[PDB]
Amino acid sequence: SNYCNQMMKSRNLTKDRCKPVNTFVHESLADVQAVCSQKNVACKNGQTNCYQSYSTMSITDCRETGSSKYPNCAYKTTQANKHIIVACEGNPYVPVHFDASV
């Protein structure tokens, strides 16, 4: 199967449902955690705990097709280099949500 169908199932996003949209980041964990001290931006929800990466990162966007339904989830895979926007929280101050990519 395609990377999205494979990884969505492996990572427990589609073993118990079909999730419409999910992004995977092909960078080290430490380089993603480093975004929490990068550019502070507003989140889509109005909160102010979001951060945009200075650099573009290698990402794969996974999005369900129009006819996809559980258990046969089906995804469209789109690969791109984009800046990421994450919401951060806690001690240590780390990513807790993937807000968007630009």
Binding site: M7, R11, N22, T23, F24, H26, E89, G90, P95, V96
Partner: peptide, 15 residues
């Protein structure tokens, strides 16, 4: 319970 930080890694990281 899975923490919010662990959830983000499982769902989004693929180094």
């Amino acid at each position: 319970k899975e923490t919010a930080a662990a959830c983000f890694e499982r769902c989004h990281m693929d180094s």
